[PDB]
A and B are shown apart, each in its own frame.
Chain A
Amino acid sequence: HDLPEGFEFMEHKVVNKDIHAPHENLETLRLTLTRQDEFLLREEPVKCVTVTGTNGEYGIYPGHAYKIVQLNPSPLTVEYTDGTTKKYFVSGGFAHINNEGSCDVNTVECTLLDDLDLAIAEKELAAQQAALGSAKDDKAKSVVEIRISVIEAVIAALKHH
């Protein structure tokens, strides 16, 4: 009695390029932006994608080398070959960049920057700041500071444009 593995029912596998192979000139990056097991974008050709990982900002274009990036709460930019821009905001996750010309950005939450409200973002920071002053212990203060970092990133993200 052998059971199927849950990945057998998934028909869109990841294609890796053999290292001993000729290079190709690619003008499109196939992006897959995903939230909580839901793709907002699927193998969607985009000219470029800008992502904020722990070390800093990465601008991924077609042909980018194989890399894994641990994202931080921050904006994410997706620019199509039309030159049109779509800006999301992510709270965390990972970005897998493949040398074959694909980028699978899996996030816990990915919301268009339009949906976020700056007025709500500002008042929320003030509330958490008061708690951080009265936060009982070190652990509570650390959690509160996590919220503030995300809020300030959101506030700064919206003030940018």
Chain B
Amino acid sequence: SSWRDHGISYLKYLNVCTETLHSTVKESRRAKYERWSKPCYTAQRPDGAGGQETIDKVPIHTKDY
């Protein structure tokens, strides 16, 4: 609805919805579904000096969208 005007993409819209849907699932069944909506990804470039630099071009957490 109003998220398009703010630049939020459709894919981010789906991720938010999926997290919310998994939130409503019973506590007994939440474990199965919640493993499909838990961010565990990052973006890194090997630094110059034997290091790793993270890249902040795309958000990882639905809170920071």
Q: Which of B1-52 contact A (CB under 8 A)?
A: 1-3, 6-8, 13-14, 16-27, 29, 33, 36-37
B65 — which chain A residues lie within 8 A by C-beta?
A: 139, 143
Q: Which of A138-155 contact B (CB under 8 A)?
A: 138-139, 142-143, 145-147, 149-151, 154
A116 at the A/B interface (Cβ < 8 Å)? yes
* Docked pose: A120 CA to B26 CA in angstroms: 7
Taking chain B's interface residues, is the majority helix, strand, or loop, or is none over half, making it mixed? helix
* Docked pose: A54 CA to B14 CA in angstroms: 14
* Docked pose: A19 CA to B20 CA in angstroms: 42
- Contact for A143 among B8, B24, B26, B36, CB less than 8 A: B8
* Docked pose: A124 CA to B30 CA in angstroms: 14
- Range of interface residues on A (Cβ < 8 Å): 20 to 34
What is B's interface to A at a CB cutoff of 8 Å? 1-3, 6-8, 13-14, 16-27, 29, 33, 36-37, 62-63, 65
